[PDB]
Design a protein around this ligand. Structure first.
Ligand SMILES: [Ca+2]
Ligand SMILES: [Ca+2]
Lengths: 211, 224
């Protein structure tokens, strides 16, 4: 067995930068080295075979280098759609084994979130549950903080949030918060507010509605 | 042109077996290998084996002792992979790929075209399709002439669901978020899109929610 080890597990660069990942095999694998790119969600895509053979289609900012047990993938001017994880593959002996991947993140200017809020659909209310949804759209960097408040009272449970992978075109993130009550509690109150902290904001931003 | 299309997601109980298809197009099926590789959610890719679409020869990975079976059907340009006696740690996305691995040993060896993937969840719990609620644009969803609207796909097992807007026609501005786990063990997600609030009464917005492990397929029209 041949153990491939990639040498930055994670790295963030700026649009236009030159970026180099390193892959190192445990035995001489000659020039039998492959590079795959995996944008989040999608399946892997071959980018380079046999150390430096570009697959037609693959932009020419990508390049391969090395022989023996050290191999290098170079992105010469990083693009926003280069957000992905990259795996090397040794094609020398069975089983062809993969590297652990190098997450590659794009750095961009600060962007403050657009905060939205969605009351529960009357549809959902018929069944005796109320989910309230707050949307933080297209912000950067990633650290944001959502607090839910009911009649100006800090809520402390029945909260779940999710954040997207980084956007392929504008490098931002989006966050979706959900506050879920029984229909009983939802109608014991009037004011539902979403409170968002993010560094591109001077002070916390509150979006709210009246039940 | 050259595309591999895979069987949809499936939930199987511990100890059952699963069989995942993979149909080819736009290339000569008999003149390549087909390889399967699995990716456990969170950490990395693993070779399972490969099969000759010409000879039918198989080479399996050692760990999967006698649990994996790879076949091909020449007439249908389709390859199959069976995984018997399923374990809780078999949950992964299961890819097929076209592999070049000829009698001439050259360095042009690779997997290219991969199938989109099949998520196989192994669990003792029962499938549950989701309820789909609209997130309607209002003045509480307007920032500078741009409205936001969505769908709330709530209470399903297992993953995954897929959302589209206007049957694939609307894509710029869409966000489908990673699913959360509820206090109950049932997943939920939301899918939103930003549009010009001017064209709110003029455009129709429909979200197409497909959760194949329950063969459910809800369309919700989202309206102000
Ligand atoms: Ca109650
Ligand atoms: Ca009242």
């Amino acid at each position: 067995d041949i153990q491939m080890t990639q040498s930055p597990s994670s790295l963030s660069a700026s649009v236009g930068d030159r970026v180099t990942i390193t892959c190192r095999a445990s035995q001489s694998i000659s020039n039998y080295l492959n590079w795959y790119q995996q944008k989040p969600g999608k399946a892997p895509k071959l980018l380079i075979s046999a150390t430096s053979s570009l697959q037609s289609g693959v932009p020419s900012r990508f390049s391969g280098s090395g022989s023996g047990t050290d191999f290098t993938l170079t992105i010469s001017s990083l693009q926003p759609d280069d957000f992905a994880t990259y795996y090397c593959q040794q094609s020398y002996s069975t089983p062809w084994t993969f590297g652990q991947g190098t997450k590659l993140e794009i750095k961009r200017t600060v962007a403050a979130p657009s905060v939205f809020i969605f009351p529960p659909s009357d549809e959902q209310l018929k069944s005796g549950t109320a989910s309230v949804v707050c949307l933080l759209n297209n912000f950067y960097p990633r650290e944001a903080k959502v607090q839910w408040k009911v009649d100006n009272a800090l809520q402390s449970g029945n909260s779940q949030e999710s954040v997207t992978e980084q956007d392929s075109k504008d490098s931002t993130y989006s966050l979706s918060s959900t506050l879920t009550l029984s229909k009983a509690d939802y109608e014991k109150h009037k004011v539902y507010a979403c409170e968002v902290t993010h560094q591109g904001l001077s002070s916390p931003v509150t979006k709210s509605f009246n039940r | 042109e050259v595309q591999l299309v895979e069987s949809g997601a499936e939930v199987k109980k511990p100890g059952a077996s699963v069989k995942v298809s993979c149909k080819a197009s736009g290339y000569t099926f008999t003149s390549y290998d087909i390889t399967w590789v699995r990716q456990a959610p969170g950490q990395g890719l693993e070779w399972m084996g490969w099969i000759s679409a010409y000879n039918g020869d198989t080479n399996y990975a050692q760990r999967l002792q006698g649990r994996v079976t790879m076949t091909t059907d020449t007439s249908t340009s389709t390859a199959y992979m069976e995984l018997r006696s399923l374990r809780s740690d078999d949950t992964a996305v299961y890819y097929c790929a076209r592999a070049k691995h000829t009698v001439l040993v050259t360095a042009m060896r690779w997997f290219d075209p991969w199938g989109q993937g099949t998520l196989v969840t192994v669990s003792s719990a029962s499938t549950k399709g989701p309820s789909v609620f609209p997130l309607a644009p209002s003045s509480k969803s307007t920032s500078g002439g741009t409205a936001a609207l969505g769908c709330l796909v709530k209470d399903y097992f297992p993953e995954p669901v897929t959302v589209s807007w206007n049957s694939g026609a609307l894509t710029s501005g869409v966000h489908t978020f990673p699913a959360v786990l509820q206090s109950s063990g049932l997943y939920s997600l939301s899918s939103v899109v930003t549009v010009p609030s001017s064209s709110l009464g003029t455009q129709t917005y429909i979200c197409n929610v497909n959760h194949k492990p329950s063969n459910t397929k809800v369309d919700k029209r989202v309206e102000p």
